Write a protein that binds this ligand. Structure first.
Ligand SMILES: CC(C)CCC[C@@H](C)[C@H]1CC[C@H]2[C@@H]3[C@@H](O)C=C4C[C@@H](O)CC[C@]4(C)[C@H]3CC[C@]12C
Length: 436
C-alpha cells in the first residue's frame, strides 16, 4: 500500500495494539511487512566508518604538520587537540549513517532483522581513490541473541587506525507510544598510540502513531582521549535547545575536570548532525566557522563480496530468503522463511543445552571486569585501555547504559555485572574460512 495508507490500515492498528502488551522484547511486536527492513542489525557496525577520509585523518596529523591539518583553526594549540577535533568530526559524521540511512533507503526507520547468534558481516573499504589510505576492514559478529549484542572492529593496518566495540539496547514504550531506547556498550578508537573512548547516546523513535518512524537523539555522548582531552556532545530535537531536529552541541575540554564548567570549553560546536554545524573557538562567537556539513559529503559504502561466495554465517547469505520475501511484501513467505531460519536456531540451542555444549564466539571474547570475575571467564590486562580512559572520564565500568558516570543511579544498581566484549585480532589472523 502507499505510505499515506499505513497509519489507518488494519495492520498498523493491530500493531499499535500489540504494543500495549509489549514484553520488552521488540521482536514480539507484530510489525506489518511494510515496516520491515531486509537489513540485519549486524550490518549497522559499518556505520562507524562510511567516511574513510575522516576515519583516517587523525593518523596523518603529527608534531610537524598539525597546524596544516585543522581547517577550522590553523592556529590550533597542539597536535593532540587537532586530532581530538578530527576525531570529533569523524564521530559526528557517523551519526547520519547510524540513524538516517533507513529513512533514505527505505522511506522511514523500519524494523531491522534480529540477528541470529553467530551471524557475521564482513567487508572492506578499498579506498581505491586514495592509495595512502590503504584497505580498511570491517568485522561484525553477533555475540549474543538473548539479548541481541553485536560486536565489531574496523581497522586500517597501513595507518594503524583501529576501532572496536559492541552494542546492545533496552527499549520500552511510553504511554504516548514513544519508543525509548537506551544504548549499552562503548567503542574504542586507536590512532597509532593515542586512544579514544566513545559512548553512544540514548535515543527515541518518534512517529509511531502516524506510521512514519524516525530516530531522534537525546542525552550525551563522550569522547575521552588518552591525551586527557574530552569532548562532551549533547543532543536535542525539534526545539528545546535548537529550533531544528537532529541538533547537538559539543564542547572540547582540556580534561574531565574542566568539563564541569562549560566556560572552560576550548571549542564549542553546534548545529545538526544530519546537516551543518559551526564551531567557535573559546568565546569568540563572532568568529564561527563551518565544522561539518553532512549534505556535502556522500557516504561511502564498504565492498561486500558477491552472495555466491559468502560463507553460510555471513548475514546477507543467511538472510537471503527472508530479505527477498520482505522486499516482495509476501506475508506468508516472510513468516515461512523467518520461521525456518529462527526455528533451526532454536533447535540448535536446545541441542547444545541437552548435549551440554556452548556456542563459541568467533572473533570476540567477553572479558569479566568485575572485582569478582567468574572463575572461567577472561579478565582484563594491566594497562587495559578501557580502564584508564574510563577512569579519566570517571565513567562506570559496569554494564550500565552507555555514558553512565560513576555514582549515577544506574551505576549504583545492585548486582550489576561488568562484562565487556573485546576483539581478538589474533583470532582473525588465524581465521581459516572467512575472507574479504
Ligand atoms: C522501527 C519500529 C517499527 C520497530 C523498532 C525498531 C528498532 C528496534 C530499531 C529502529 C532504529 C534502530 C537503531 C538504529 O536507529 C541505529 C542504531 C545504531 C547502531 O550503532 C546500533 C543499533 C541501533 C541503536 C539500532 C537499534 C534498533 C533500532 C532502535
Amino acid at each position: 500500500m502507499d505510505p499515506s495508507q499505513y497509519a489507518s490500515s488494519s495492520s498498523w492498528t493491530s500493531f499499535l495494539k500489540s504494543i500495549a502488551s509489549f514484553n520488552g522484547d521488540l521482536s514480539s511486536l507484530s510489525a506489518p511487512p511494510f515496516i520491515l527492513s531486509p537489513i540485519s542489525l549486524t550490518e549497522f557496525s559499518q556505520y562507524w566508518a562510511e567516511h574513510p577520509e575522516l576515519f583516517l585523518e587523525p593518523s596523518f596529523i603529527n608534531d610537524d604538520n598539525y597546524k596544516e591539518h585543522c581547517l577550522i583553526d590553523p592556529e590550533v594549540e597542539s597536535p593532540e587537540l587537532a586530532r581530538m577535533l578530527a576525531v570529533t568530526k569523524w564521530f559526528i559524521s557517523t551519526l547520519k549513517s547510524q540513524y538516517c540511512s533507513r529513512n533514505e533507503s527505505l522511506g522511514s526507520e523500519k524494523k531491522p532483522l534480529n540477528p541470529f547468534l553467530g551471524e557475521l558481516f564482513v567487508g572492506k573499504w578499498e579506498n581505491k581513490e586514495h592509495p595512502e589510505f590503504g584497505e580498511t576492514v570491517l568485522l561484525s559478529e553477533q555475540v549474543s541473541h538473548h539479548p541481541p549484542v553485536t560486536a565489531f572492529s574496523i581497522f586500517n593496518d597501513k595507518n594503524k587506525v583501529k576501532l572496536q566495540g559492541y552494542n546492545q539496547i533496552k527499549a520500552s514504550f511510553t504511554k504516548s507510544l514513544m519508543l525509548t531506547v537506551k544504548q549499552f556498550g562503548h567503542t574504542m578508537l586507536d590512532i597509532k598510540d593515542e586512544s579514544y573512548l566513545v559512548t553512544p547516546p540514548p535515543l527515541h523513535i518518534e512517529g509511531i502513531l502516524v506510521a512514519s518512524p524516525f530516530v531522534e537523539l537525546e542525552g550525551k555522548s563522550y569522547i575521552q582521549s588518552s591525551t586527557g582531552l574530552l569532548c562532551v556532545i549533547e543532543f536535542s530535537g525539534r526545539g528545546y535547545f535548537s529550533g531544528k531536529k537532529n541538533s547537538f552541541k559539543a564542547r572540547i575540554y582540556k580534561d574531565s575536570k574542566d568539563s564541569k564548567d562549560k566556560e572552560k570549553a576550548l571549542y564549542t560546536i553546534s548545529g545538526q548532525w544530519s546537516g551543518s554545524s559551526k564551531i567557535i573557538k573559546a568565546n569568540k562567537k563572532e568568529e564561527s566557522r563551518l565544522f561539518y556539513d553532512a549534505a556535502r559529503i556522500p557516504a561511502e559504502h564498504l565492498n561486500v563480496k558477491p552472495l555466491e561466495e559468502q560463507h553460510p554465517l555471513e548475514s546477507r547469505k543467511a538472510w537471503y530468503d527472508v530479505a527477498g520475501a520482505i522486499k516482495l511484501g509476501d506475508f506468508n513467505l516472510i513468516a515461512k522463511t523467518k520461521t525456518e531460519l529462527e526455528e533451526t536456531q532454536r533447535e540448535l540451542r536446545k541441542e547444545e543445552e541437552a548435549k551440554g555444549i556452548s556456542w563459541q564466539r568467533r572473533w570476540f571474547k567477553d572479558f569479566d571486569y568485575s572485582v569478582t570475575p567468574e572463575e572461567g571467564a577472561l579478565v582484563p590486562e594491566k594497562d587495559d585501555t578501557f580502564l584508564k580512559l574510563a577512569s579519566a572520564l570517571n565513567l562506570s565500568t559496569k554494564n550500565a547504559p552507555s555514558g553512565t558516570l560513576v555514582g549515577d543511579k544506574e551505576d549504583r544498581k545492585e548486582d550489576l555485572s561488568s562484562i565487556h566484549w573485546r576483539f581478538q585480532r589474533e583470532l582473525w589472523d588465524e581465521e581459516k574460512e572467512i575472507v574479504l
